[model samples]
Target: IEISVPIVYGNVAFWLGKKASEYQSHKWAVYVRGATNEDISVVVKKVVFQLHSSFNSPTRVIEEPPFEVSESGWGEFEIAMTLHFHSDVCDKPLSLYHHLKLYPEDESGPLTMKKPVVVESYDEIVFPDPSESFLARVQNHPALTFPRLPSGY
Candidate 1:
């Protein structure tokens, strides 16, 4: 049997609010096979967790855009964007753009898992495999798991 699932790439675009203010926006693209589509919602959750934990900053993802599904049997889905950060973070009115490309874990090319990557040429960091790595860490961490809370029971 062949295996198929959704793959995703994400980016963040900080938006300028009023003068001397800024906000953040996140963009993601998902590609799925067969009947399954990329679960951007889940990816968004992982990203938010990553950002919040890394920067110790609060973030919000604008999810008003309706999810579109394929009807022509093309089997590809993508979420080009999402607005995340708010204008309250800083007063400089400067926006930050971050991009992450999702690729098969065991592949070769411009962005292969084994090759070194340079973002702005000022520094280089090897991109991690994002697909299950994010979720896997959370799932495997007992400290992160929580039992269902009783609802006034």
Candidate 2:
């Protein structure tokens, strides 16, 4: 009747290098991945990231896994992400938001070129009233978790 899958999405930002100017000091990549590094293509069809309007084009549609985008920015902002699931998985896409953290929460002296600021969130997509075919199809999918049958067979 139902199935759930855990997913992970977030960003990793690294200093662009000592030579970089103040305005573009860091470059980062935002992405979505299966919690266990399993293949998420089994459920997710695409991922769209809504970047800040300041970007050339804020909306980025990723058609395949390693679904993510890379950009450079000196400031932090909220990022909106929409996940499009497969036809059988769901009809409506799931939306989530995350804060981009470029600097340390607490003062940690000067920043290093080798260290990166990381921010991530965990989410579980649950499919209720799943069709029998859908259930059977994803039964063995590594990205999905199913409930154990009755104690007594």
Candidate 3:
């Protein structure tokens, strides 16, 4: 299996109004592979975490059932998500995140929102890897640069 990464980076543009409250509309148009013809569902979970190098704090923000398309074939999945937040809380550099986990039958909560692979900007999401089993290409943001591999020894 190939790794599925997100292509929506900072494309969800909108400034937080006064009082720290805000609402905005965002859409993530992605191309990924899912079991075709088989009715399967995945749980969608969301979280609010602080992006601090010195800390690892996570808070459960939203949790929902799996989004089943019921279509069996390779196609684009336009998963539109709207986000709302309080200016007071979001004013501090934060990223809105959602997790999707596929559940066929009695299984659940395995791949709910653990590893997030970001590709491009939120407005325009694109994938450089043509071999990606799934491609989440956003129309608003396109990727012009390739992501460098991290150093490790």
Candidate 4:
């Protein structure tokens, strides 16, 4: 028995009623989320996000869909994201890191950016010789679907 899950990492930008005179008033939200094909709710119960020290709140826990965090800053920093799975999965928690990018491709002139930077990726978590209960639950899930693996073990 085997299962494959998908994951993604990316960021987006938005204007938060800030004037151009301000040094950095734009909002740059960085996030790590489940890919389109995966049902994150069934597999992941919560996520812990760690950010830079400049922000008032550096640590955040997300317990719902569209797992992500938002911050407003002009510079880039490394973000640490930890994923906690459901009790029945019987797998270790996953940790990932992402480098925040706030600027557009062309930054030679004034920072007048309109587009967001989105870098998405697909990942698979293989469960070998999974427990009977876990397999049964996954198979019975209405929205959960498993990807086909190569022939043979």
Best candidate according to TM-score: 2
Q: Considering every candidate listed, which one attains the maximal lDDT? A: 2
All models, RMSD in angstroms: 18.1, 2.1, 20.2, 4.2
Q: Model 1 reaches what TM-score against the true structure?
A: 0.21
lDDT for position 151 in model 3: 92
Query: In candidate 4, what are the lDDT values of residues 16-125, reduced to their tens digit?
Result: 45453365656777666556634666877888888889877899998887688876765677888888888888568888877776655535656545555554445655
lDDT of 2 by residue, 30-79 (tens): 98888888988899899999999889889999998888899997878999
For all candidates in order, the CA lDDT equals 0.26, 0.85, 0.26, 0.69
Clashing pairs in 1: 15-23, 24-85, 25-84, 26-82
Better of 1 and 3 by lDDT: 1
lDDT of 3 by residue, 105-142 (tens): 24456743223322322332222333331223322122
TM-score of each: 0.21, 0.89, 0.19, 0.76
lDDT of 1: 0.26
Report model 2's TM-score to 2 decimal places.
Answer: 0.89
Candidate 3: stretches off by over 4 Å: 11-44, 51-60, 65-153
Off by over 4 Å in 2: 106-113
lDDT of 3 at 85: 23
> Which of candidates 2 and 4 reaches a greater TM-score?
2
